Structure 1
Amino acid sequence: KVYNDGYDDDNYDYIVKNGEKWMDRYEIDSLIGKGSFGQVVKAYDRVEQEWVAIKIIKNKKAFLNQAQIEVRLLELMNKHDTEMKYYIVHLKRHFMFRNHLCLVFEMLSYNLYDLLRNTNFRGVSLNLTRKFAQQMCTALLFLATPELSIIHCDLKPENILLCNPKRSAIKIVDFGSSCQLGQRIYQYIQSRFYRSPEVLLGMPYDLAIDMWSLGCILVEMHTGEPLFSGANEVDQMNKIVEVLGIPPAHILDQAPKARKFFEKLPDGTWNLKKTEYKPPGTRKLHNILGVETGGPGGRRAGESGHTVADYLKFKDLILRMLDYDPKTRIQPYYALQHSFFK
């Protein structure tokens, strides 16, 4: 008949009403987001006198406990980034309201997927891509702080938002899938397009998987399309192989799930299993980027900052971010000193 005395639905979510006023403070405007966790709502904070984004968790033990883990990591990051200069979203406070946990985040603008949708998935400039890349590398450097050692674990364009609609400033959002460095508990992780080869191969992983995802994201911001748009793990691995070639022998020998995508021969070398795809390493990033042909689809020809010299610096940085080996894959600190950021 009713769930939580008529405040909830069958999905254990709060029935958001327009114009409702919680706790003589938050004035609820409208629903701005939906998810597995629950819902996200735009509201005016009458005490602080500002708009805020409130994430309302489902009235259910599982999501509550997972959200408290998120609350712990957000509050941990906030005490190390008190001046808010490392581009992580700010959890302002949290409260319980009619059995729902409510996280109050700051109000931000469009996500980077909405930005790509406005271009009809043709992408943004190398200059705007540089400003996003600088910011994400700074954010990843902050996550590498040894007391934090946080893996976001689900970096993608929809989890990167702009601060203001008329500025380039960004903040990373959604630490629900995030964890700190540790022993391996989880294996099916990250969104598929931005999923590192070590995750796909069932190998050990650390903070380098976020640098993989970043590499995939920065190409997508410029071209407009995902770099590796795999419909499944096999297709995902084959689309990586097209660009980067077959992974090294020493990695595949140490991979529990190598046989899912590859086939060891009598001589000891690894080929692809036939499931169609270009041969290994023949869909070059050089040609995807259009280094010499005026950028993606020749659309940047004649634009300032879109020369062969400029494109090579971006190309080089990305191939270091998309390094197959996570132990020699570029780190936030060195990535920030790359020629591309001069």
Structure 2
Amino acid sequence: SMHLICQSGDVLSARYEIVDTLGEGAFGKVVECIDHKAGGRHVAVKIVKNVDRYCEAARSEIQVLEHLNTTDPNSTFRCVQMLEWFEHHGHICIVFELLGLSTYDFIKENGFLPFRLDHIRKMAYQICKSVNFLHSNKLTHTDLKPENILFVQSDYTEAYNPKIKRDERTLINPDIKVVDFGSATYDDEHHSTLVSTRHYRAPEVILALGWSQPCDVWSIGCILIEYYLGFTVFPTHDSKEHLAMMERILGPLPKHMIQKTRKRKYFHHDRLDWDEHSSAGRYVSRACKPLKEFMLSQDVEHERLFDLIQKMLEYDPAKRITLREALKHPFFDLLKKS
């Protein structure tokens, strides 16, 4: 029924007039509205599908953001500001400060070109700071990805780039915020070993070994390579294929993780049950290669980023870098200058 209530001109809750759709997802829709009771200020309204799983996720997000916005009222740690919620013809709607495009959408609109490295450095720093603030308050996000990082302002300048024979957009201000707190889980809540639709998903989640804060660090590792390359390094929707891709980029999985997993289907003896010479197997060999071979330059700033990424993509969550540590990494020295 959503198409009947999310059109340009519709009014929600006797105050918000829909201008246009900003984007869609599995959850529903985000629309830009005029708030007729706050002087015409533009806001963003998430309209949530009338489906039990998303309604429960939306109620959860509301609890989480209430706690985070009162703990950090000035958005020092860059979590999105929720302004209120209401119900409209059986759909939960949540009102946010209006931001710019998602980082995914910016890449897409720019023809799948990567961000340049000085912007990557700022964005990475801000993402690590924001999610470490979550990790300090006994939370894990669990669903970090480029669609869920948004530019405060997505405005750009435009010129012809003769090095790659095409026009190129250059961001003016790379400041970001983190969104989507519907899967966010407290340390003391139930940690469901089941997880749903994502491929920023850590190896401990795939193998059902239990998870906590480190799973976020793995996701951030994936985001940073994507910003550097302009495309995903794990393009797959099959778990076993995903594990095969990991092995090609990062080497074989630790033996103690293979012995512990209850998911025996993926393994024969203590090896991944993967035919290298199948149709899908040859696609993996051709798309994926060892991590450092993705580097586009041997310059030391590039090597610094890739050392950070590698520590984030440690298989064993007990050994993986924490965000506290990552904020001190040399890659970020260039921001602290004086």
TM-score (norm 1): 0.83
Partner deviation per Cα, 1:176-198 (whole Å, 9 max, x = no partner)? 23222344324224612x11101
Q: CA deviation at 1:64?
A: 3.0
Corresponding residue for residue 272 of structure 1: 272
Question: What CA distance in whole angstroms lies between the structure 2 residues aligned with 1:291 and 1:99?
Answer: 53
Q: CA deviation at 1:81?
A: 1.5
Corresponding residue for residue 184 of structure 1: 191
Corresponding residue for residue 143 of structure 2: 154
| 1:149-228 paired onto structure 2 within 5 Å | 149-166=138-155, 167-181=173-187, 182-189=189-196, 191-192=198-199, 194-228=200-234
Corresponding residue for residue 297 of structure 1: none
Cα contact 1:229–1:239 (8 A) shared by 2: no
1:29 matched to 2:36: no
SS in 2 for 1:242: helix
Question: What CA distance in whole angstroms lies between the structure 1 residues aligned with 2:23 and 2:310?
Answer: 35
Q: 2:69 aligns with which of 69, 78, 102?
A: 78
Q: 1:262 aligns with which of 262, 267, 279?
A: 267
Question: What CA distance in whole angstroms lies between the structure 2 residues aligned with 1:233 and 1:130?
Answer: 31
Cα contact 1:189–1:195 (8 A) shared by 2: no
Cα contact 1:13–1:59 (8 A) shared by 2: no
Could you tell which deviates more after superposition, 38-47 or 327-336?
38-47
Corresponding residue for residue 127 of structure 2: 136
Question: What CA distance in whole angstroms lies between the structure 2 residues aligned with 1:22 and 1:251?
Answer: 50
Q: CA deviation at 1:233?
A: 0.6
Corresponding residue for residue 318 of structure 2: 327
Corresponding residue for residue 255 of structure 2: 249
1:238 matched to 2:238: no
Cα contact 1:203–1:254 (8 A) shared by 2: yes
Cα contact 1:91–1:105 (8 A) shared by 2: yes
Cα contact 1:234–1:260 (8 A) shared by 2: no
| 1:286-297 paired onto structure 2 within 5 Å | 286-292=292-298
1:47 to 1:126, Cα distance in 2 relative to 1, 3 A: same
Q: CA deviation at 1:218?
A: 0.3
> How high is the sequence identity, in percent, across the aligned residues?
33
Q: CA deviation at 1:20?
A: 3.0
Cα contact 1:31–1:41 (8 A) shared by 2: yes
SS in 2 for 1:221: helix
Cα contact 2:185–2:191 (8 A) shared by 1: no
SS in 1 for 2:74: coil
Question: What CA distance in whole angstroms lies between the structure 2 residues aligned with 1:14 and 1:38?
Answer: 13
Q: CA deviation at 1:243?
A: 1.1
Cα contact 1:53–1:107 (8 A) shared by 2: yes
TM-score (norm 2): 0.84
Corresponding residue for residue 170 of structure 2: none
SS in 2 for 1:253: helix
Question: What CA distance in whole angstroms lies between the structure 2 residues aligned with 1:23 and 1:220?
Answer: 39
Q: 1:107 aligns with which of 74, 79, 98?
A: 98
Partner deviation per Cα, 1:7-48 (whole Å, 9 max, x = no partner)? xx2xx6652232233445322212223334333221011333
1:79 to 1:14, Cα distance in 2 relative to 1, 3 A: farther
Partner deviation per Cα, 1:198-230 (whole Å, 9 max, x = no partner)? 111111100111110100110110111112222
Question: What CA distance in whole angstroms lies between the structure 2 residues aligned with 1:168 and 1:120?
Answer: 18
Cα contact 1:57–1:64 (8 A) shared by 2: yes
SS in 1 for 2:143: coil
Question: What CA distance in whole angstroms lies between the structure 2 residues aligned with 1:312 and 1:60?
Answer: 46
Q: For this pair of structures, how many residues does the alignment match?
A: 306
Q: CA deviation at 1:115?
A: 1.9
Cα contact 1:14–1:56 (8 A) shared by 2: no
1:20 matched to 2:10: yes
Question: What CA distance in whole angstroms lies between the structure 2 residues aligned with 1:31 and 1:253?
Answer: 48
> Which runs of 5 or more structure 2 residues have no equivalent in the other structure?
156-172, 276-281, 334-338
Question: What CA distance in whole angstroms lies between the structure 1 residues aligned with 2:114 and 2:17?
Answer: 37
Q: CA deviation at 1:111?
A: 1.0
Q: CA deviation at 1:88?
A: 1.1
SS in 1 for 2:105: helix
